[PDB]
Amino acid sequence: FKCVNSLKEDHNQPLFGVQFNWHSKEGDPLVFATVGSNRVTLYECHSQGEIRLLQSYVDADADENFYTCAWTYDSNTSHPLLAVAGSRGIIRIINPITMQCIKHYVGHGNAINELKFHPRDPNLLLSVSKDHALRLWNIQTDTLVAIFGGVEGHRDEVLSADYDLLGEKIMSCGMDHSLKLWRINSKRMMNAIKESYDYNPNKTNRPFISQKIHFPDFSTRDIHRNYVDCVRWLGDLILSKSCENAIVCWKPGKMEDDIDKIKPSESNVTILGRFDYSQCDIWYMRFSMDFWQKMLALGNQVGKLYVWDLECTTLTHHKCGAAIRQTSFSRDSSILIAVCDDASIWRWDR
Ligand SMILES: CS(=O)(=O)c1ccc(-c2cnc(NCc3cccc4c3CCO4)n3cnnc23)cc1
Ligand SMILES: [Mg+2]
Ligand SMILES: [Mg+2]
Numbered sequence: 001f002k003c004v005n006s007l008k009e010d011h012n013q014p015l016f017g018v019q020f021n022w023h024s025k026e027g028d029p030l031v032f033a034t035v036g037s038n039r040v041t042l043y044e045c046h047s048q049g050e051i052r053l054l055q056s057y058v059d060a061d062a063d064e065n066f067y068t069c070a071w072t073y074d075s076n077t078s079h080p081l082l083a084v085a086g087s088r089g090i091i092r093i094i095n096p097i098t099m100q101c102i103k104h105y106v107g108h109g110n111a112i113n114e115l116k117f118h119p120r121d122p123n124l125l126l127s128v129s130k131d132h133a134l135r136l137w138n139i140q141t142d143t144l145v146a147i148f149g150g151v152e153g154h155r156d157e158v159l160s161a162d163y164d165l166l167g168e169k170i171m172s173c174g175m176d177h178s179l180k181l182w183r184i185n186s187k188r189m190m191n192a193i194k195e196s197y198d199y200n201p202n203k204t205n206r207p208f209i210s211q212k213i214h215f216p217d218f219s220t221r222d223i224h225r226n227y228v229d230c231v232r233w234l235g236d237l238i239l240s241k242s243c244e245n246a247i248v249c250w251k252p253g254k255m256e257d258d259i260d261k262i263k264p265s266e267s268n269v270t271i272l273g274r275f276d277y278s279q280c281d282i283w284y285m286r287f288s289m290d291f292w293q294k295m296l297a298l299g300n301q302v303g304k305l306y307v308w309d310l311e312c313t314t315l316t317h318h319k320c321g322a323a324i325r326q327t328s329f330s331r332d333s334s335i336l337i338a339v340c341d342d343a344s345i346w347r348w349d350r
């Protein structure tokens with residue numbers, strides 16, 4: 001990788017999120033979104049390292065602090081859509097063509113730390129919050145499908161979550177040092193999703209009733225000893241990190257235990273490997289994988305970018321010295337974008 005370009009957003013506030021739109025065809029514009037301050041900005045990647053500013057969304061609330069964004073598409077037209085959220089605990093769905101807010105969802109008792117769209121169902125949006133819960137939304141019918149949390153749910157702020165490859169299950173993590181598994185392919189969750197598609201408030205005076213999932217399908221506090229701020233699936237395996245200068249690769253149960261045979265009382269975990277690095281011991285630092293899950297990237301607190309081949313390399317620039325909060329690879333993995341605490345954006349080309 002070579003650093004081909006960089007820019008600084010005029011708001012001068014930290015950028016906490018960056019996502020390339022992976023829902024565009026080959027030959028279509030390479031677009032990425034950044035989120036920082038109360039702003040959402042779209043950029044287009046062109047040849048010879050050129051970055052073109054497309055549009056900017058500025059939230060009506062000046063006190064909003066966007067922490068996360070995630071792309072989807074409208075199933076009927078294939079038109080892209082962008083979901084954003086942060087400190088206000090409000091999810092906003094933005095039309096990226098006009099950069100206008102189409103709709104909003106309220107419900108979480110606090111800030112939203114991460115948003116993820118179901119890998120198969122583009123209408124299924126997952127949010128994780130400081131209120132200790134995860135929420136699954138159906139954005140086609142504007143319904144709250146399920147709330148994951150309660151007694152045996154997270155006991156502190158949820159920082160991250162990820163769906164597995166097929167979207168049959170979710171792994172979540174947070175400030176309680178725990179990683180929790182929630183199956184959404186159960187008869188209960190499959191019926192709840194089916195019911196959310198039939199719901200329409202114009203044909204009934206009764207509200208749609210959300211599933212209250214109080215119990216995870218697996219839980220562990222034996223991987224990390226501090227806030228777990230990033231979790232991703234790698235097939236049936238899990239990649240997770242805390243502020244202990246390591247990304248841990250692990251699985252629930254014993255070495256040969258099938259993840260779909262695991263009982264909720266499973267007390268074993270198996271560590272399969274570790275990706276070690278330096279100076280990334282502050283909270284709220286996200287790692288990312290390319291579409292192919294062949295590369296793993298993580299920025300550190302002094303602007304160094306670590307890249308590992310999943311099938312190490314350190315990317316540095318003398319002008320890049322602020323914490324890299326999040327990175328995103330373009331769908332073809334030819335471009336890696338890093339966003340920083342000083343509102344700076346860095347473009348690395350393969
Ligand atoms: C020192 S400072 O500049 O004043 C500052 C201020 C706020 C935050 C902050 C960032 N991000 C989130 N949530 C999203 C999140 C969650 C897990 C990992 C992760 C992210 C974003 C990048 O990596 N926050 C929730 N509460 N505060 C925060 C960090 C530093
Ligand atoms: Mg084996
Ligand atoms: Mg299976």
Ligand SMILES: [Mg+2]
Pocket residue numbers: 268269270271
């Ligand atoms: Mg063990």
